[PDB]
From Swiss-Prot, chain B:
Mode of membrane association: Single-pass type II membrane protein
Lineage: Eukaryota, Metazoa, Chordata, Craniata, Vertebrata
S-S pairs: C4-C13, C7-C18, C35-C117, C95-C109
Extracellular side: 1-120
Name assigned to this protein: NKG2-D type II integral membrane protein
UniProt keywords, alphabetically: Adaptive immunity, Cell membrane, Differentiation, Disulfide bond, Glycoprotein, Immunity, Innate immunity, Lectin, Membrane, Receptor, Signal-anchor, Transmembrane, Transmembrane helix
Domain C-type lectin per the UniProt entry, residue ranges: 6-119
Stated induction or repression of this protein's expression: Up-regulated by interleukin IL15 in primary NK cells.
Length: 118, 120
């Protein structure tokens, strides 16, 4: 047993990360700004074990991966995501299980915001 | 305060409730026993606000709602709140599957289904 967080009330907490799904479709840049306004960033995938809840995510959602590195400038670690071509573009949609579909950054999509606690 | 729980280590926490999805298909009675083995119960729906994450649940899963011939009641013996679930009959049964958004499908208790456990 343990506690999870800290997270704001409207976020799912899993292994001390906070996740929130946004159903209003936006391009990658507008989604990034939305997460920032919530003291967060777009989903960053850094651990298959500590983020194994992402195996259960359905549909396709902006994550913070750009052409590959994350918003915060950090690199994509190997053996975390299978990146699959789909549409010509420089952004990627998260899909289960641990897949990234390359997508046009200007195409509206739903998105996942995430806050790390440490 | 800003922490959620307590909950078992690898469960999801939301508004101080803990949830775990089980992909193994079991009948209602086996699912109930599985949650109890983990010091939990099958999903109980009490608030569309506190449990609005249930709007995002895909597919159908056992919850702790049973018919006692009476009315629909939860495992713990408490009553189903009105205006919470829309109950839809499509099989002869005394048990119910949760489906989004805030629906309960009457289902044969013996039919294997995936299930959701919950702890508070
Ligand atoms: O992924 C979407 N739904 C699955 C789903 O239920 N998947 C299953 C598939 N097959 C079978 C079962 C599930 C499943 C069933 C019950 C639970 C339970 F234990 F919770 F009870 C969890 C999973 C999902 C995944 C993680 C957490 C939750 C939640 F906790 F909210 F219930 C739900 C989904 C679908 N449409 C739009 C948006 C989403 C979505 C996107 C991001 C996020 C996140 F996490 F990033 F915020 C959450 C939801």
């Amino acid at each position: 047993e343990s506690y999870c967080g800290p997270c704001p009330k409207n976020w799912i907490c899993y292994k001390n990360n906070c996740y929130q799904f946004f159903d209003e479709e936006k391009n990658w840049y507008e989604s990034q700004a939305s997460c920032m306004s919530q003291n967060a960033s777009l989903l960053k995938v850094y651990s298959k074990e500590d983020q194994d809840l992402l195996k259960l995510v359905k549909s396709y959602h902006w994550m913070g991966l750009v052409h590959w590195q994350w918003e915060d400038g950090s690199s994509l670690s190997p053996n975390l995501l299978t990146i699959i071509e789909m549409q010509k573009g420089d952004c990627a949609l998260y899909a289960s299980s641990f897949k990234g579909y390359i997508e046009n950054c200007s195409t509206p999509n739903t998105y996942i915001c995430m806050q790390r606690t440490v």
